[PDB]
Amino acid sequence: MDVLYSLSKTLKDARDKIVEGTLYSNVSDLIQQFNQMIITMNGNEFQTGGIGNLPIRNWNFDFGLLGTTLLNLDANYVETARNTIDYFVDFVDNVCMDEMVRESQRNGIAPQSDSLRKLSGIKFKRINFDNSS
Amino acid sequence: ESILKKLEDIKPEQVKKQTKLFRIFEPRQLPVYRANGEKELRNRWYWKLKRDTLPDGDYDVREYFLNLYDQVLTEMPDYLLLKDMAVENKNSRDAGKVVDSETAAICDAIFQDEETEGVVRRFIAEMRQRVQADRNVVNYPSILHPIDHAFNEYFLQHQLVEPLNNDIIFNYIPERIRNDVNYILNMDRNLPSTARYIRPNLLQDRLNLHDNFESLWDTITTSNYILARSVVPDLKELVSTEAQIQKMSQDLQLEALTIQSETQFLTGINSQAANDCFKTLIAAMLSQRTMSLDFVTTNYMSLISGMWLLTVVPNDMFIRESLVACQLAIINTIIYPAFGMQRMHYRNGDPQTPFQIAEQQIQNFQVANWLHFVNNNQFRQVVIDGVLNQVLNDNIRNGHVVNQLMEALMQLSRQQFPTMPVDYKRSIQRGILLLSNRLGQLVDLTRLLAYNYETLMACITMNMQHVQTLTTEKLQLTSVTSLCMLIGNATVIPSPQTLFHYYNVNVNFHSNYNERINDAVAIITAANRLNLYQKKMKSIVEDFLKRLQIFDISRVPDDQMYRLRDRLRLLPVEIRRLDIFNLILMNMEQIERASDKIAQGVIIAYRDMQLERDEMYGYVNIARNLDGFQQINLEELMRTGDYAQITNMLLNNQPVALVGALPFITDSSVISLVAKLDATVFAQIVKLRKVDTLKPILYKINSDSNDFYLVANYDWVPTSTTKVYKQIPQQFDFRASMHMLTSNLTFTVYSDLLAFVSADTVEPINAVAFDNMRIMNEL
Amino acid sequence: GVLNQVLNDNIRNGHVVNQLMEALMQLSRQQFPTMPVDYKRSIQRGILLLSNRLGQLVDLTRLLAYNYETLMACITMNMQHVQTLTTEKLQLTSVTSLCMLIGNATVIPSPQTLFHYYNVNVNFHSNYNERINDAVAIITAANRLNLY
Amino acid sequence: LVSTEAQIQKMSQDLQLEALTIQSETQFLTGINSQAANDCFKTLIAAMLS
């Protein structure tokens, strides 16, 4: 849950802060967190399930890191970041939907979807950052 | 250089061939005796050790078996062709062949012996080889002990040769070299279906010597740096040094009667320095050896060349102090004075480099953008074709960063230098003009450096690890100025022969490294599983380092060797070595019990026990097992030196079994057995508190005994109070020992695959880079 | 009946050296924020010089503790701990030599060395007690004989 | 004991004292030898015993 929330928070920060013309110093820590998320998710295969009418969806992460070279972010940088952010946002939304439609009588506080259960593994703990909601 | 000689002298791997079957046992004729001890006229063949040299003491026996493991690993071949071992079986009906000559000797001895049964002679007459030429297979009859057969069958079925063809030879070339349009590869031979080769073992570093073995990693990186220097191509058709010096003098407007900074701009501009800089840069990036910057702050041309150098080379390639000094000189000599900013008061040990502070403080977009790029220009760690590589930024590879640097420099030239005398601005402008009169040459040089780097990087087999090294390679900034001022339009790329030589040296070193790792791991794991607690393993590791041929073990402390031992101990054993050790572990008890020099123990009972009947002994006081007897371990007794228990048991006549590899006396005297001499050999244990001198008596009572009539004339079965814990030899069954050893009928093994590849380069003027454009484009 | 000064069991088995190693391994990963980087590298590499001898230092600690206990078995007078007027000066360079040069050769006191040490201690203790007895006897006799 | 030459060269290579600006470059590794190690062993055990 904290890893999923951290993914969503990183994506929201990227959408809000990775904008044309912004100083790289405004995004340096955000870029580092986003690249950490990319490294952590790369090479992992996820499936969001087919409960009800939710389509079964497969997710592969083979993304390159975001650049660190520009003093101010330009349009090309924002477009590449937008592509990656769109894929990640789709994945996170699908995982959230898969988790919301499930329930358990024995352990209802524990993750029910397989994607969130996988994200509870230790290898994803690196993604975890500010939990302020 | 001695380092280059040591690294390039390494041969691929000594290919081992088997010339005879590995044997621990041989048949031997022995006299046999009847149940009453009378000698039978017929003899019998028994399995015996060929070299019966097993030592006394269980610990020494385990040491002997470790040594035997080493011997078997030495004798294990890479491939085997049994026809090389095949000899004529003279008694074969078809005049066929057998392997090896030792089998032929056994066959002759059995066939000629008058006591041999006719069925065995028929069987020997049927022993011949079968050739299946269609399958390229041959089977040969061989006479082997079951353990000998197990070892030789393992050798036959686990050979290291694989089929070799033109496609394999071509794919042996690195994929990036084949994918390069600048090289044309050719072959003039069709390798036959019977061609073979042995793959190098290119496993990536299992010892992680880049992590915490800083001295060893320094040595490794120095060797890599020297080799890379040896393979980096020389610059051709450099601009004439005299002509360039004249042109620079005209541009600088040198004045005889005035002291000027611009004069120093001409310092150290020569082709030797240019070639040295080119080689140093590419070799340092290839070996991932840290570089150190050497410059004189009074030379501003050195600082402008350093600006180019920090633009193109990622800054982690430089030791931090030298990079900080160079950046501070650049900031305080060119940038801040240009923009009228107060001189940066930079603290030694600052978390930020001078360029990071300047980037935060510089309001000019071009200068700050170039500063940001220099601050963030890093290598990219990428696994290509299974090897970790440090890849340059694509804008470095195509040379666009040169344009960004030139934009920054042109912005600096336009500044007023408000707080400086006009001659200072003139000097800085003259240096910038020297650099910017060669903008196209700088783009070409950046592209050439990047292309040569990646082309030679395709030839590296071991992971390129980016860690700052203990020592650095000094790079003079005047050499960078020489390279910038003297580089022409001639494209130089690594020769295909140079690429193949570099790749072969890397493969040889990698294979040797992995093979020595395997040897050390096998020995260490075997010594641990053989419980050799008194064995100090430093020697093993020492030998390991000595066989890498690039370290001076005199400079390696013992603590480092034991850390290497600890890291090696965690690695799994190679499959062939592990299986050989499994065979040795499985069969060592049987090999030890076959020795006639040692017994497995002695049972001291204090009651009469009838001597056992065994045809190869007559009557003998042998114990097949230690059942019903308390066991005292002689190894533990010798290790602890506490003799209270054994002393109390011997003084109280308490039946016991002393267990451990012991020498024994063979005594055929009936009178000695009646005298009960075997029971008189243990008081010395109490007297001296030593068991290394213990030597129990083994009675061998039969008709060859002088006083055997006592056995014969009194219907008397001999009895003894002591027994020797020993096994009896196994009969040699000729038919059971015959095995058909199968191998390939014939093949040829090849060593250097790239010898079959002739490679050439396109015209350098037409050589292209990754972006399909020519590496160098200036007129 | 003899007072003895004994070590923590973690010293005797040498396990605490691991903690030392752990601690100084952390010191090798620290930034040293404001320190010049060459001096920082030298300090961290020295820290690692001591760190990488973990096995040798565990062996040395166990050997030192064992030798101490074995020779302390031979002490007969109470091991009283007092801060003395003068000290024995211990060079830390000698400590560095011991830490960087110790191998794996165990050296324990010889049985004859232990017996000699014990005999010397017993002789000194017995002579001490006997001379106390003689002095007390003569003093008491002089007082009771009124030899003012 | 470990070879004093090997350990000294190892320590010199790791510490890189010559490259530093320490006013006492020679004195750093002085006193590192087998005699000093034996003296330290003896001093420690004897001081604890007494």
Cβ count within 10 A of residue B174 = 22
Type of residue at C115:
F
- Nearest CB to D14 within list B470, B558, B559: B470
Identify any residues that bridge with B65 across adjacent strands, giving them in sequence order: none
- What is the distance, to the nearest Å, from the Cα of residue B589 to the centroid of all Cα atoms in its chain? 32
Residue B728 per-residue DSSP state: P
Contacts of B223 (CB under 8 A, 6+ apart): B3, B6, B7, B509, B550
Identify any residues that bridge with B344 across adjacent strands, giving them in sequence order: none
Interface contact flag, B349 C37, Cβ < 8 Å:
yes
Measured between CA atoms, how close is D17 to chain C, in angstroms?
7
User: How far apart are alpha carbons B334 and B129 in whole angstroms?
Assistant: 87
- What is the distance, to the nearest Å, from the Cα of residue B30 to the centroid of all Cα atoms in its chain? 47
CA end-to-end distance (rounded Å), chain D? 26
Cβ count within 10 A of residue C29 = 8
Here the tokens at position B1 are: 């250089």
3-class DSSP assignment, residue B314: coil
User: How far apart are alpha carbons B397 and C98 in whole angstroms?
Assistant: 53
3-class DSSP assignment, residue B475: strand
Contacts of B422 (CB under 8 A, 6+ apart): none
Task: Look up tokens 């019903």; give the residue.
Answer: B628
Q: What is the resolution of this structure in A?
A: 2.7
Measured between CA atoms, how close is B470 to chain D, in angstroms?
7
Cβ count within 10 A of residue B11 = 9
Here the tokens at position B89 are: 């079986």
Q: Do chains C and A touch (3 or more CB pairs under 8 A)?
A: no
Contacts of B491 (CB under 8 A, 6+ apart): B448, B764, B765, B767, B774, B775, B776
Instruction: Kindly write down the DSSP assignment for every residue of A55-102, as one continuous string.
Output: PPEEEE--PPPPP---SB--HHHHHHHHHHHHHHHHHHHHHHHHHHT-
B753 touches B172 (CB < 8 A): yes
What helix, strand, coil percent values describe chain B, rounded to 5? 45, 15, 35
3-class DSSP assignment, residue B623: strand
Write the CA distances from B533 to B63, B71, B638, B759, C15, integer angstroms: 11, 21, 14, 56, 21
Interface contact flag, C42 D15, Cβ < 8 Å:
yes
Chain D: which residues have CB within 8 Å of chain C?
A: 1-2, 4, 7, 10-11, 14-17, 19-20, 30-34, 36-37, 39-41, 43-49
D32 touches C96 (CB < 8 A): yes
**Phi and psi (nearest 5°) for C127?**
-65, -40
Beta pairing class for B97-98 and B130-132: unpaired
Here the tokens at position B186 are: 């050719």
List all chains that touch chain C, counting a touch as 3 or more CB pairs closer than 8 Å.
B, D
**Phi and psi (nearest 5°) for B671?**
-65, -40
Beta pairing class for B656-663 and B598-610: antiparallel
User: How far apart are alpha carbons D1 and C101 in whole angstroms?
Assistant: 5
Contacts of C144 (CB under 8 A, 6+ apart): none
Contact list, B368 vs chain A (CB under 8 Å): 71
Cβ count within 10 A of residue B337 = 21
B538 touches B545 (CB < 8 A): no
Interface contact flag, C34 B350, Cβ < 8 Å:
yes
CA end-to-end distance (rounded Å), chain C? 39
Task: Look up tokens 């002789």; give the residue.
Answer: C123
Which chain B residue is nearest to residue D9, measuring alpha carbons?
A: B555
User: A24 CB near a chain B CB, below 8 Å?
Assistant: yes
Which chain B residue is nearest to residue A25, measuring alpha carbons?
A: B360
Contact list, D1 vs chain B (CB under 8 Å): none
Measured between CA atoms, how close is D25 to chain C, in angstroms?
13
Burial class (CB in 10 A: 0-12, 13-18, 19+), A45: exposed
Contact list, C105 vs chain D (CB under 8 Å): 1
Contacts of B412 (CB under 8 A, 6+ apart): B334, B335, B338, B367, B428, B432
B-C contacts (CB, under 8 Å): 35
User: How far apart are alpha carbons B705 and A64 in whole angstroms?
Assistant: 89
Tally the residues of chain D: 50
The domain tally of chain B equals 1
Give the domain extent around B160: 1-779
Alpha helices in B288-344 (DSSP H): 300-312, 320-330, 336-339
- What is the distance, to the nearest Å, from the Cα of residue C120 to the centroid of all Cα atoms in its chain? 20
Measured between CA atoms, how close is C53 to chain D, in angstroms?
12
Sign of the torsion formed by the C-alpha atoms of B36, B39, B43 and B48: positive
User: How far apart are alpha carbons B571 and B518 in whole angstroms?
Assistant: 9
Interface contact flag, A71 B368, Cβ < 8 Å:
yes
User: How far apart are alpha carbons B720 and B319 in whole angstroms?
Assistant: 82
Interface test with B, best of A31, A69, A70, A77 (most B CBs within 10 A): A69
Contact list, B558 vs chain D (CB under 8 Å): 2-3
Contacts of B397 (CB under 8 A, 6+ apart): B447, B450, B451, B454, B769, B770, B771
3-class DSSP assignment, residue D17: coil
Type of residue at B688:
L
Alpha helices in chain C (DSSP H): 9-12, 16-29, 37-51, 54-72, 92-101, 111-144
Here the tokens at position B596 are: 């006639």
Here the tokens at position B254 are: 């040198």
Type of residue at A116:
L
Contact list, A25 vs chain B (CB under 8 Å): 360
Contacts of B427 (CB under 8 A, 6+ apart): B260, B261, B262, B300
Please, what's the b/e burial string for B199-231 (b: 16 or more CB within 10 A of its CB; e: otherwise)? ebbebebbbebbebbbbbbbbbbbbbbbbbbbb
User: How far apart are alpha carbons C68 and C117 in whole angstroms?
Assistant: 13
Beta pairing class for B618-620 and B697-701: antiparallel
Measured between CA atoms, how close is C25 to chain B, in angstroms?
11
| H or E segment to which residue B685 belongs | helix B683-688
Chain B: which residues have CB within 8 Å of chain C?
A: 212, 214, 320-321, 324, 347-351, 536, 558-560, 562-563, 566
Which chain B residue is nearest to residue A69, measuring alpha carbons?
A: B373
User: How far apart are alpha carbons D29 and D15 in whole angstroms?
Assistant: 10
- Nearest CB to D13 within list B470, B558, B559: B470
3-class DSSP assignment, residue A27: coil
User: How far apart are alpha carbons B647 and B78 in whole angstroms?
Assistant: 54
